[PDB]
Design a binder for this molecule. Sequence first.
Ligand SMILES: *[C@@H]1O[C@H](CO)[C@@H](O[C@@H]2O[C@H](CO)[C@@H](O)[C@H](O)[C@H]2NC(C)=O)[C@H](O)[C@H]1NC(C)=O
Ligand SMILES: *[C@@H]1O[C@H](CO)[C@@H](O)[C@H](O)[C@H]1NC(C)=O
Lengths: 49, 49
Amino acid sequence: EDQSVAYSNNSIAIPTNFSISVTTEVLPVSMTKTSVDCNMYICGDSTEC
Amino acid sequence: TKSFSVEKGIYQTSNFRVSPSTEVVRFPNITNLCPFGQVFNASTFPSVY
Ligand SMILES: *[C@@H]1O[C@H](CO)[C@@H](O[C@@H]2O[C@H](CO)[C@@H](O)[C@H](O)[C@H]2NC(C)=O)[C@H](O)[C@H]1NC(C)=O
Ligand SMILES: *[C@@H]1O[C@H](CO)[C@@H](O)[C@H](O)[C@H]1NC(C)=O
């Protein structure tokens, strides 16, 4: 939305009361630890491979 | 880890420990010989067309 305001050279806005706001910030930290057996994946149970 | 000296820690290893010995060869119970006659030892063969 547009809330156009022009200017002033002798006016000042003062806030008269406040609100305490609780916000949530969500941040990943770690990922799963995975290991691979190269021989078992590539060849399985074959000696020739 | 291809070395004769290993530093302190925990490591993941391969199998290197168990190998098969015996064998299982179960096949169906048929025994009748296939008719190699009339195919190899036949009297007349047809024309190629
Ligand atoms: C700014 O102050 C006024 C009081 O002067 C607040 O209005 C009060 O709000 C509380 C709840 O948070 C009520 O229990 C009070 O009864 C209200 N006023 C009175 C004294 O009757 C106002 O909430 C404050 N600022 C903001 C925007 O939260
Ligand atoms: C700004 O302030 C001066 C002070 O002399 C005044 O003359 C002028 O008219 C004002 N202009 C505005 C933006 O009101």
